[PDB]
Amino acid sequence: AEQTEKSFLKQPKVFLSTKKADKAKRPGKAGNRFWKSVGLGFKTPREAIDGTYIDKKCPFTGTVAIRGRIIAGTCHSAKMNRTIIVRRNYLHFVKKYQRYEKRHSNIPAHISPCFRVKEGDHVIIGQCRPLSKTVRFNVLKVVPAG
Amino acid sequence: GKTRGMGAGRKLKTHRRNQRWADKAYKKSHLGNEWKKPFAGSSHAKGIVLEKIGIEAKQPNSAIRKCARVQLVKNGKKIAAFVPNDGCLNFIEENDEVLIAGFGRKGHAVGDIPGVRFKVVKVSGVSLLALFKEKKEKPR
């Protein structure tokens, strides 16, 4: 079902054709789906542990690590393959007038199939290595608007 | 009234930015037209005396101001430069190096002399003050 590419898609360093298969072993062993806790107090979604998708850029089942900044925001666009635009809204202080002005930043973030998101949801992203030209963040937690 | 909200910093800054162009000094500084002036932003300029001329003063006064017509060397622009210090027109000759300066009002005409914002300060490398006071002589 997940094999939608011109290539087979496998989790790196997981031997699927193992003969001594076992489910009591740790993830990635005996043909088990690999997954990890990203750390920083973030729970691993159960749909990543029980998923069948293959995403190398997934924070929980892929090869990327979360290190650096942790940024909150709102889903501003979700029209790309596994990538969403996160809009951050903040107040910029103007020194001379002692006032604030509203400013925004559009941060591209990779979203793994373990989350389904819609424009307007509150998301938490964590900094990772560069994944594309503009993406340096991975969605870590999605809070729906309602 | 004027905007006062804590969240109206952008409004205030943009309004000040737009209104600063009404001030004459600000717009003179930040328009870039001072680079099209004869001096092109420099305090002094050198030039060739083209011809000695006498231009009449304003209506209340009655005098011939006896300025000089100078072609600048840096850009080839012809200007009229006043020659102060009674008798100093005789130190001025055609095809003679002169150092011009501003007439003191920043391109605005000065006194009863119409259309003149430049004075001769140095001729042939010798200051006009020295020639007036006979402290130095004009080279031949």
Place this chain on the structure above:
Amino acid sequence: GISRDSMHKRRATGGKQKAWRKKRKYELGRQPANTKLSSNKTVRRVRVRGGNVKWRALRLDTGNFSWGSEAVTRKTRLLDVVYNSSNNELVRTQTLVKNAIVQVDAAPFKQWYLTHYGVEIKSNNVQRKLEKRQQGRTLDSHIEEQFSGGRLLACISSRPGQCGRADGYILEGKELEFYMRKLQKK
């Protein structure tokens, strides 16, 4: 020369970026090895940053291949390139790249299987160990039907243009079924 800099790209907004510096050597790229499957082995020494060595294979005909379920690794000849997921140009040109699907000689694996299991696909100790291994022995009949032809489907897991070698694993299981469907659809 080939560069890897973000200078020449457009911005994410679409705006053009004016250059503020010439190309640095620390951001170079080099021309691809374009490793061909051929019995004229040529691997060239590439001097890289830090005075280190990169091995650039131009023509390769032999590789080190692992049969993961059997946990055995043998040196086998490369016979053909059959599937590439990025470009069939690399299939027709017989270009060896990482994740290409190739035909490899099955003779070393047949020999090892005969020696280790006693089964073709002289002592009490030897026969006892052979019967112990033969108990629970299970092949998957797809590897078997390609053993019949002497050619095993394999995936190149090494990068020939970087390490100068064409190494890989023998395809098994779901990956094997996927690539057999791809090759029959070809």
Place this chain on the structure above:
Amino acid sequence: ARGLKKHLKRLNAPSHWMLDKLGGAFAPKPSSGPHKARECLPLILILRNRLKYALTYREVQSILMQRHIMVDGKVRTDKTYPAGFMDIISIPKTGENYRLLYDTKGRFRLHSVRDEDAKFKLCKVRSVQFGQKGIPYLNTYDGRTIRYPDPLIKANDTIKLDLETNKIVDFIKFDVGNVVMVTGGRNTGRVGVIKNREKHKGTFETIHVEDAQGHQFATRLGNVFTIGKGTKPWVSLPKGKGIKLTIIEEQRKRDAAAQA
């Protein structure tokens, strides 16, 4: 730049060196070595600016090329050798030994030590992990690698190293209640006991230290160096005893000294 910098401009030199502004265009750029360039005291500075043995760059060269100076038991002839915190500087001709400690103002001070006390240094464990062959190994912040360390030793620990034998003779576990010296930041040279360790996931860890007189200060984990098990440091301390004084109390001391 197209490579490493070889020169240190005198203005850009570390401020704890107390180099003067008009002494020249340049400062001694510390050579690579056990301590970081920004946190060390080069040998030339110790010999000329501090101990006054030499008066010039060339005189420092003359002293060092005579093999008169040992750093932690070993002869050094490099003038820009980066001598650092807790290093033993011995001159086995005048029979004097110095431990590089910090005064409460953040500046390295050559502290005279006994001959027996110059036989060990205190090192801070940077990490413990498996090397080649699966052999456990320890590394410190002063550049030493020690193989087969005691398994009870963890990162951020303080080990006592015998310079003669080059082995860990004792170690201190980084725990609450151990006397420490701050080696970095604005509290450099301050000595107190750890009261609590506040940990925050993914960022630097904060240590809360209280000195003997009761003043409390906080600093990052990378700037804390354990110097004793409990309230008794394993080394001797400079005259300040790590107790920082406010400028008002410093003025009180100066007034009292002038009055006497």
Place this chain on the structure above:
RNA sequence: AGAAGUCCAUUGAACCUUAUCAUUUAGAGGAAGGAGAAGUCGUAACAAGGUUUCCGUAGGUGAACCUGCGGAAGGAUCAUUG
């Protein structure tokens, strides 16, 4: 082992071509504005300025201006329960 040479690829200066942009920029002729002498024709605005002034729009006239329609007092009326 290997030079000259050679093949393909790549980076690519530079040259030519089309058009565009940014400049600098002559320019017959036309037509403004300002300043200075200051001549001429009148007297339009200031007094109810001798047709009260002005605003908008349209037409006309040597020129100031004139006139039509609607508007204002900044009017020469704060005022007719008479």
Place this chain on the structure above:
RNA sequence: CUCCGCCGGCACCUUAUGAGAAAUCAAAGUCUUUGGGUUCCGGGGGGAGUAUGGUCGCAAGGCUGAAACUUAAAGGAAUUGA
């Protein structure tokens, strides 16, 4: 019809304890004892609502809108005189 209230509206009269350059204004007051909210909009007088670009309109024109240059005042309210 008459009288007394309440709310809302067009206004009017008196008064300064206010404000203002004053005229005057019961808001044009509650401002150097300076901050209720918000929109538009001015920065000496001309050149100039002109040139140019853009846009709208069949057109007339509307909206947006300079600069060079020139000038020591222009202007407001009030007083006395003519």
Place this chain on the structure above:
RNA sequence: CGUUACUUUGAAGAAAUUAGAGUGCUCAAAGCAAGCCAUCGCUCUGGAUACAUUAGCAUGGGAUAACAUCAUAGGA
């Protein structure tokens, strides 16, 4: 197992420049020296401290304010 602004405290925010402690370069602009009855030496001599928007990290506070909810609580 609701955020944020705001505020408080802490760590950082190079040096030089600035403010500022000490110090009689003869004064001063400076400099980072120096001082001690004179000392085969000493004062562990000194070579402080403050400031450092905004943004980032951490601590306490929740008045003011912003956003999100806010009778299937269908609560536990």
Place this chain on the structure above:
RNA sequence: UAGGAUAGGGGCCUACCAUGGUGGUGACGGGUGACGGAGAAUUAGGGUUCGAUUCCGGAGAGGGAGCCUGAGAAACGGCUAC
């Protein structure tokens, strides 16, 4: 997505695929007599203007481009070409 390349992440490049990405919270474009900062001048406070220059960072060696050596250079008091 899969490769190639690189010291290494990455449309950095290639093949295939999808239609995205930025924008009055000003994208894109234009101007700058624009290298950025530490800082400088003037400052009751707030502020205005400057910051080529000795400290830090960047960039260039007539203009482009390409390289060899080397740990480190797209080096120019190194080479190759226009």
Place this chain on the structure above:
RNA sequence: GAAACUGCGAAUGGCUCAUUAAAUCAGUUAUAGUUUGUUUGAUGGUAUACUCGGAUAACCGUAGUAAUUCUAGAGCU
């Protein structure tokens, strides 16, 4: 001990501000995304030996060219 071979350096420093307007740069992060001569510390076992081979510079002497740390050939080590 000249010369010369070998090794190392010449990527620092000095100069300038042309280009460059989220770009440089500043503060603040990250490398679990890498290289790093050198310094410091530690580490190094399964591949005629009482010690192998051929060159080459300096040197020497035949030169070429108008000429250049332009250059060819011969004899050594």
